[PDB]
From a paper:
BRDs are evolutionarily conserved and present in diverse nuclear proteins comprising HATs (GCN5, PCAF), ATP-dependent chromatin-remodeling complexes (BAZ1B), helicases (SMARCA), methyltransferases (MLL, ASH1L), transcriptional coactivators (TRIM/TIF1, TAFs) transcriptional mediators (TAF1), nuclear-scaffolding proteins (PB1), and the BET family (Muller et al., 2011). The most notable structural difference within the BRD core fold is a hairpin insertion located between helix αZ and the ZA loop that is present in all family VIII members. The proximity to the Kac binding site suggests that this insert may play a role in recruitment of acetylated binding partners. The nuclear body protein SP140 as well as the related protein LOC93349 and PCAF showed nonspecific binding to most peptides. In contrast, the second, fourth, fifth, and sixth BRD of PB1, MLL, and TRIM28 interacted with only a few histone Kac peptides.
Bromodomains (BRDs) are protein interaction modules that specifically recognize ε-N-lysine acetylation motifs, a key event in the reading process of epigenetic marks. The 61 BRDs in the human genome cluster into eight families based on structure/sequence similarity. The four helices form a deep cavity that is extended by the two loop regions (ZA and BC loops), creating a largely hydrophobic Kac binding pocket.
Residue numbers in the entry: 620 to 734
Amino acid sequence: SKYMTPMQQKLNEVYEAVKNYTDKRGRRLSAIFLRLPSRSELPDYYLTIKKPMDMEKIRSHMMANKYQDIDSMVEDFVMMFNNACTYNEPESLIYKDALVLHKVLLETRRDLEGD
Ligand SMILES: [Cl-]
């Protein structure tokens, strides 16, 4: 029950790498990516963004064993970061953090390449 398969562990490690990333100043960038606002808190968002995505949705999908490989998980993270960069202006913190976390994501995948 509690022992993950290698693929489950890899998925978890990728997810945790993005979640736990702290920069050189101690700032945990993922805090604002965990959960989107509701449709009634920010309707404009859901009019603008075709496929809403946040880390909780990612985590839920992973916990359900719905990701069959790492690339499928990466695709959802990419969607999330691209949505943040579509809704928000390039000057904004959310846009900038999405770029940093995208780099964390890809470096992590590359680092785990051989497992
Ligand atoms: Cl980095």
